């Protein structure tokens, strides 16, 4: 994550995710941010978060 007036922040991931925006359709992209210790990662030819 790029915090305000900062190129980095070591405590923060900025996190992009697919989600159903209507009740039961219209998948789209959306973004937020989270603390690390709700986040994990290993897999994919390129990385992938959960």
């Amino acid at each position: 994550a790029t915090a305000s007036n900062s190129s980095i922040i070591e405590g923060m991931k900025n996190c992009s995710f697919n989600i159903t925006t209507e009740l039961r359709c219209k998948r789209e992209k959306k973004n937020a941010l989270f603390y690390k210790l709700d986040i994990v990662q290993l897999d994919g030819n390129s990385s992938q978060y959960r």
Partner: nanobody, 127 residues
Framework: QVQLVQSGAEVKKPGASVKVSCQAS????????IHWVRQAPGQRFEWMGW????????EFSAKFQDRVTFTADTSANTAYMELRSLRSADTAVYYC????????????????????WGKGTTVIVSS
């Protein structure tokens, strides 16, 4: 010092079950997750699963979920495993393990590497 002590060696019938124990010392047993690991002769180690004595949550490799079961007791300082429906491929040396301590800078599950092991136990599937 830290040590994990295991049951005696086993030779058991095909199709039956094999049950193993792993008793610890040198640390509070209720405050470290515990792993289970197997190695056939000359082969890789294969993950079995993990258990957290503090809660009893369990997670298995889906390859073995129908075959393996764990449990742990805080009053015994001991973890148990049970592998059902033995086959000849199960002939292997089995281990229990302990993870390293979490530290402030670590992300989740950085510490589940194997910090300490036991001396292992031989299991053979034979009549």
């Amino acid at each position: 010092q830290v040590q994990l002590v295991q049951s005696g060696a086993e030779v058991k019938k095909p199709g039956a079950s094999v049950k193993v124990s792993c008793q610890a010392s040198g640390y509070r047993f209720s405050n470290f997750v515990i792993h289970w690991v197997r190695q056939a002769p000359g082969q890789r180690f294969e993950w079995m699963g993990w258990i957290n004595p503090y809660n009893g949550n369990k997670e298995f490799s889906a390859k073995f979920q129908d075959r393996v079961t764990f449990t742990a007791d805080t009053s015994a300082n001991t973890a148990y495993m049970e592998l059902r429906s033995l086959r000849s491929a199960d002939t292997a040396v089995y281990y229990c393990a302990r993870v390293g301590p979490y530290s402030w800078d670590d992300s989740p599950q950085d510490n589940y590497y194997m910090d300490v092991w036991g001396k292992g136990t031989t299991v053979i599937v034979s009549s």
